């Protein structure tokens, strides 16, 4: 069976509670976090020791902004159920670009050549970045079950990280055979696992990596806080 990886919280951070978040990602010392409501939606940069909101844009009403990756000087998101998707200057947040896919847009990321998306199946979509077209695809399966509803995703040292939110884990894909090589349980940080929980409760939905300190933070809708995590090696 697939093994559970340990973990370690190095460091906690405050996170602003009416973050919705749908997604997130880190890049030249900030966050970058989706929020998600079809009644008022945003992408914000964020300060990570504060928790402090630096730039916002709002999302193209009446859309409800779903996962987001950046990719050289663009920010690209999804929307969750009107099939459309926006790509905005990164520096600026403001929109340049709009384009349309088949389906629901769930989660996003990148490896250093294409983008990697989520539709709520156990199908990731590779997608070129330029054009946003489908080239690829990634067939998720745990110990041979098709693994569906990926909230979030975020690729890591050459590794695919799905959260699974309604098992409260992360899935770590080997993205050459899409098989779960390890599960991270982390079910000690979600703030309340013992309720009755739907995709739009305090979910886990934000996984950001920063590559060049090697740093993994996860957050989610409504946490108070952000942590900074690190898996511990597995055996074998
Ligand atoms: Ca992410």
């Not at 779903?66 to 159920?81: E, H, N, P, S």
């Not at 809708?221 to 511990?232: A, G, N, Q, S, V």
């Amino acid at each position: 069976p697939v093994p559970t990886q340990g973990y370690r919280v190095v460091k906690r951070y405050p996170h602003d509670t009416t973050a919705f978040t749908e997604g997130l990602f880190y890049l030249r010392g900030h966050l970058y976090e989706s929020t998600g409501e079809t009644g008022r939606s945003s992408v914000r940069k964020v300060d990570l020791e504060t928790g402090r909101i630096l730039q916002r844009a709002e999302v193209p009403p009446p859309y409800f902004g779903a996962g987001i990756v950046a990719w050289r000087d663009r920010l690209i998101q999804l929307t969750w159920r009107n099939h459309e998707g926006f790509v905005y200057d990164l520096a600026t947040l403001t929109p340049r670009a709009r384009f349309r896919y088949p389906g629901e847009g769930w989660a996003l990321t990148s490896d250093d050549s294409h983008l990697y998306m989520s539709d709520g199946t156990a199908v990731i979509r590779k997608l070129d970045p330029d054009t946003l077209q489908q080239v690829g695809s990634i067939k998720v399966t745990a110990g041979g079950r098709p693994l569906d509803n990926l909230n979030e995703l975020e690729w890591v040292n050459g590794e695919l990280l799905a959260n699974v939110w309604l098992t409260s884990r992360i899935a770590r894909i080997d993205p050459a055979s899409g098989k779960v090589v390890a599960w991270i349980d982390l079910q000690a940080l979600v703030p309340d696992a013992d309720a009755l929980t739907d995709s739009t409760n305090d979910v886990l939905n934000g996984i950001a990596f920063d590559a060049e300190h090697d740093r993994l933070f996860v957050t989610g809708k409504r946490w108070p806080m952000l942590y900074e995590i690190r898996l511990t090696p597995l055996p074998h």
